[PDB]
Every structure is written in structure tokens, then in C-alpha cells.
Write an enzyme that holds these catalytic residues in place. Structure first.
Site, PDB file in Angstrom:
ATOM      1  N   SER A 286       5.526  67.514  -4.738  1.00 52.69           N
ATOM      2  CA  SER A 286       5.859  67.047  -6.079  1.00 52.69           C
ATOM      3  C   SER A 286       4.897  65.950  -6.539  1.00 52.69           C
ATOM      4  O   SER A 286       5.302  64.862  -6.950  1.00 52.69           O
ATOM      5  CB  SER A 286       7.316  66.587  -6.142  1.00 52.69           C
ATOM      6  OG  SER A 286       7.821  66.763  -7.455  1.00 52.69           O
TER       7      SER A 286
ATOM      8  N   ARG B  72      20.887  66.941  -2.667  1.00 57.94           N
ATOM      9  CA  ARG B  72      20.570  67.943  -3.685  1.00 57.94           C
ATOM     10  C   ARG B  72      20.572  69.339  -3.072  1.00 57.94           C
ATOM     11  O   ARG B  72      21.221  70.258  -3.586  1.00 57.94           O
ATOM     12  CB  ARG B  72      19.219  67.637  -4.348  1.00 57.94           C
ATOM     13  CG  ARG B  72      19.174  66.312  -5.129  1.00 57.94           C
ATOM     14  CD  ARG B  72      17.760  65.955  -5.603  1.00 57.94           C
ATOM     15  NE  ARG B  72      16.807  65.836  -4.504  1.00 57.94           N
ATOM     16  CZ  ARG B  72      15.497  65.659  -4.674  1.00 57.94           C
ATOM     17  NH1 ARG B  72      14.998  65.573  -5.901  1.00 57.94           N
ATOM     18  NH2 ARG B  72      14.686  65.569  -3.626  1.00 57.94           N
TER      19      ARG B  72
ATOM     20  N   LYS C 117       7.511  70.714 -13.390  1.00 57.26           N
ATOM     21  CA  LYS C 117       6.298  71.281 -12.801  1.00 57.26           C
ATOM     22  C   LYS C 117       6.260  72.805 -12.909  1.00 57.26           C
ATOM     23  O   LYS C 117       5.170  73.400 -12.856  1.00 57.26           O
ATOM     24  CB  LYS C 117       6.173  70.846 -11.340  1.00 57.26           C
ATOM     25  CG  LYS C 117       5.718  69.390 -11.172  1.00 57.26           C
ATOM     26  CD  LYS C 117       5.460  69.045  -9.708  1.00 57.26           C
ATOM     27  CE  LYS C 117       4.885  67.616  -9.574  1.00 57.26           C
ATOM     28  NZ  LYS C 117       5.971  66.592  -9.686  1.00 57.26           N
TER      29      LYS C 117
ATOM     30  N   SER D  37      10.580  66.203 -12.280  1.00 52.54           N
ATOM     31  CA  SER D  37       9.636  67.097 -11.607  1.00 52.54           C
ATOM     32  C   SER D  37      10.034  68.575 -11.668  1.00 52.54           C
ATOM     33  O   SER D  37       9.217  69.430 -11.297  1.00 52.54           O
ATOM     34  CB  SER D  37       9.444  66.671 -10.149  1.00 52.54           C
ATOM     35  OG  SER D  37       9.122  65.289 -10.051  1.00 52.54           O
TER      36      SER D  37
END
Ligand code: IM2
Ligand code: IM2
Ligand code: CA
Ligand code: CA
Ligand code: CA
Ligand code: CA
Ligand code: CL
Ligand code: CL
Ligand code: CL
Ligand code: CL
Lengths: 243, 243
Positions: free
Chosen positions: B96, B228, B51, B48
């Protein structure tokens, strides 16, 4: 537009020994709310909330190239320490650096400044006074409801300046963001002409709606300045707009 | 030599019982920093994080008209509940929403997607696979270092699309803002091909500098996704980039 009074909001002014008005506008519903319908429509000097239209005009005319252009400190030491350094548009907005914007207004000039404030339908559209200070001690006046009307146009890129200028100014208005909301806004503090007041105007972006706000409040000393945001956010929390 | 290995950051991985890389780029100093030079240059599926270029290309080509255009849910109930509704560019980035972007890619088409990725110098520029899933299970690969290179171009509006497209995507990347910093970033989670990894790439805007970052970490299960951002923020706090 059609306006509902919510006097219960006044508790947040009362508990902070303060007086003022919060105006909210639900964009989806096309409905406004305020604790004080009369003060909502009372016009005051905009003070540093005028950095929003001043920024737009300076960008649209090329007085400011972009949000990275550096505005050099003029060398005069002033009382607010963040002012005594170079700035770009982002930091000049963030720290509300008046001298940078006075320089913009000198370059824009009276003729173009007046033409643009009429084009924006900004407040009473009156720029009497010094071209480099009329929004601090001149004839211009704007009410909280009139701040909303102007901000709605800015949000929709409907003001009569370039789309690019409106996008850049909205970037520069960024104040707070997280996973629940985004606030784009500008503070002000009018002291040169009575009544001394504080301002906070802008909007809250949600996933599926936008809430515009404009508040002002009596500000007899600078020790109350944080109440501009604090009281607004308590109203936002009361209405379940932010958690 | 523009990179410096700082293996002390490995402490933030180990005490979360994790394995991965964090890469930082100091824009003012033009110097980079990482806990692991070799993993920093190891290319993975973007998942993702794709994107960001996908959004840029869709906007430049008019597939997306602006950030308010509504993309209707296709009626297929998917595992992530926030995907099962209408979205615009802002919310499709925030949540997302893969199906929205898969549709963008079909409208962009193979030939135009290939030309744009070459223009961007994006990763290995290879779009082998399905036009609507090559960044999930096709041939495209990008390293954390190559993510920084791409993000630097976007930040400076130097990519090969309109300035407008780049400003809109940077607005859509907004993740966090406060009085101390602004983070524009995009998460990713590659599961379809081994190794399963999670991404966070973007930058931190300060008053007088910009710090670009790109991290990835082994992500065997969906429950470590929060590290993350958490591990990246520990590295940023250690280097005194954010308070
Ligand atoms: C804009 O309204 C003013 C300008 C008229 O001076 C600037 C200064 C401030 S407040 C700084 C005062 N703090 C210490 N006493 C602001 C503001 O709106 O916060 N903008
Ligand atoms: C993009 O990388 C993925 C896509 C390939 O599915 C989406 C989904 C997620 S994580 C949602 C998983 N939570 C529940 N177990 C992300 C993300 O980057 O966080 N993007
Ligand atoms: Ca209260
Ligand atoms: Ca003067
Ligand atoms: Ca720790
Ligand atoms: Ca190339
Ligand atoms: Cl000002
Ligand atoms: Cl923004
Ligand atoms: Cl995607
Ligand atoms: Cl370059």
C-alpha cells in the site's frame, strides 16, 4: 545456462522412499540448480502439464473464449469424481479434467497443434500419436530443464501467442498465494507409458525475484502423488525461498 | 429489495470490542447481506482502497506500462519501512505504497481523473481537493455498498478501461489462494479526516460462485488493523463461504 548440482536435496527423496529430480532456476541470477543433472535433462511424457500449452493454443485460436466459458460434461461417468460435472478453464485446470482438454485438442487439430508446439519450442516438438492423447501416450517428450525454458517464456509473455492468452493461462495456473509468495504451477501424472512418473512445474513469485521449478519423480502408485508438492516445497524451504 | 440485515454478525464485532459493518454479495443469487444496513450505505473516504481505480486509470492511460515497471523510491524516508524502496505495481499494492500512487495521480491529472471516476460511477464521483490526495483528505466518498457495485464491474471486465488494465489490476489484488478459495482484495486505513476507519474490500472466488465483500470498522488506533481481515473471515466462515 550454467548448472550447479546440490546432492543434499536428495535427502528429501530418500526420507520419503522416493526417487526423482528437482530443478530450480533463479531468474535474477540466471542460475540453475538440481539434485541430478542427468535426470534434469531426461525427457518424459508431459501428461497433464501439457494443459499449459494446450490452454494457450485453445485461447489464442478462440476455441476457448475466456476463463468463464462453460465446458459441458459429456455425460460419461469417469473414476475421478470432480470430472463428472461442467467446468470452466479455472476449474478444469484445478482438477486436471482430461476430457475437457481432449476436446480442445480435437478442435485445434493436428496441423495447428504441431505448428504451435514448434513455435513454442516445446520439448521434442513431436506430436506423433492420437491428436486427442499424444501428450498421454504419443511421441511428445519434455525434460524438467525444458519445462523451465518454456515456463520462463510464458512468465515474460514471450511465447508466440497473444499477451491475453498468456495472462489468462497464468491466472488459471494459480495454486497458492499468501503474504510471502505466489505459486503458479501445474501437476502431472503419467501412467500410460513406463516409467510411471509424477510432475510439478511452475514458479514461485517473490517480492523481488522469481524462482522457476520443475520436478518429476517415480510414481509406482497414486498414494505418492502428494509427494510431488511436498518434496518440492522442502527443497524451496531448504534454499530459503519460502519460509 | 436486494439486501438482508443479519444482526447476528454483530457478535464478531462486539467480542473484538469493535464497531463496524461487513457487507456480502452472492453473485449467483444476486442477493446481499449485512449486519447493519445503515452503516453499509454510509460513505467514507476510500483511503488506500482507492488504489484499485487509481491503478486501472494509470494502466489504461499508459502512466504504468505493465506490472513490471519499476517506480524508484524518491529518497524520502517515511514511517512505513516497506515504502522506502523501489516498487512495481504488484509490490506497491501489496505494501500500500501511497507515494507511488500519489505520483500516478499527478500524471493522470485532474481532468482525466474526473472523467474516469464518472465513467466508473465510483462513489460520489467528487474529486474536490488536491489531485494527489483527494482520496485521503478531499471530497470523494464511497460506501461499502458502492464498493461492491464497483468491484462487480471490475470482476466482469465491464469498467470503462481496457480488458488488459482490468486483468492486470485483478492480478495485483491477489491476496490469498489455496485449494479452497482465492481472495482478491485491498485494505485501507483512513486517518486524515474523522472518523478514523479501516477498510477491506474485494471478493472470494469459489469453484462455482463469487462472493463480493466490503467492510469498514472504527479504527481509533493502528493496533486493531488486523481485525479488518480477521472479522471478515469470521463472517465468511459463519456463512460457510470459506472452510
Ligand atoms: C494428468 O496428468 C492426469 C491425467 C493423465 O489422468 C490427471 C489426473 C491426476 S491425478 C488423479 C489420480 N488420483 C487418484 N488416483 C492428475 C494430477 O496431475 O494430479 N492429472
Ligand atoms: C491507506 O489506506 C494507508 C495510507 C493512507 O497511509 C496505507 C497504510 C496502511 S496501514 C499501515 C499502518 N501500520 C502501522 N501503524 C494501509 C493499509 O490499508 O493497511 N494502507
Ligand atoms: Ca525434508
Ligand atoms: Ca481418442
Ligand atoms: Ca470469534
Ligand atoms: Ca454516476
Ligand atoms: Cl490433459
Ligand atoms: Cl492471478
Ligand atoms: Cl493510496
Ligand atoms: Cl453493471
Amino acid at each position: 545456462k550454467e548448472w550447479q548440482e546440490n546432492k543434499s536435496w536428495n535427502a528429501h527423496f530418500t526420507e520419503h522412499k522416493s526417487q526423482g529430480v528437482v530443478v530450480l532456476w533463479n531468474e535474477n541470477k540466471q542460475q540453475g540448480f538440481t539434485n541430478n543433472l542427468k535426470r534434469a535433462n531426461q525427457a518424459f511424457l508431459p501428461a497433464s502439464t501439457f494443459k499449459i500449452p494446450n490452454s494457450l493454443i485453445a485461447l489464442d485460436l478462440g476455441v476457448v473464449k475466456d476463463e468463464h466459458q462453460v465446458f459441458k460434461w459429456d455425460g460419461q461417468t469417469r473414476d475421478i469424481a470432480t470430472w463428472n460435472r461442467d467446468h470452466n478453464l479455472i476449474t478444469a485446470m484445478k482438477y486436471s479434467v482430461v476430457p475437457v482438454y481432449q476436446e480442445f485438442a480435437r478442435q485445434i487439430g493436428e496441423a495447428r497443434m504441431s505448428k504451435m508446439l514448434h513455435a513454442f519450442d516445446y520439448g521434442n516438438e513431436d506430436i506423433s500419436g492420437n491428436v486427442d492423447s499424444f501428450w498421454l501416450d504419443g511421441g511428445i517428450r519434455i525434460s524438467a530443464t525444458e519445462q523451465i525454458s518454456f515456463l520462463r517464456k510464458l512468465y515474460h509473455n514471450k511465447l508466440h501467442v497473444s499477451e491475453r492468452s498468456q495472462r489468462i493461462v497464468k491466472q488459471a495456473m494459480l495454486t497458492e498465494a499468501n503474504g510471502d509468495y505466489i505459486i503458479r504451477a501445474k501437476t502431472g501424472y503419467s501412467t500410460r507409458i513406463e516409467p510411471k512418473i509424477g510432475w510439478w512445474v511452475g514458479w514461485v513469485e517473490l517480492d523481488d525475484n522469481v524462482w522457476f521449478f520443475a520436478m518429476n519423480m517415480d510414481m509406482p502408485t497414486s498414494d505418492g502423488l502428494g509427494l510431488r508438492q511436498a518434496i518440492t516445497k522442502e527443497v524451496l524451504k531448504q534454499e530459503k525461498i519460502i519460509p
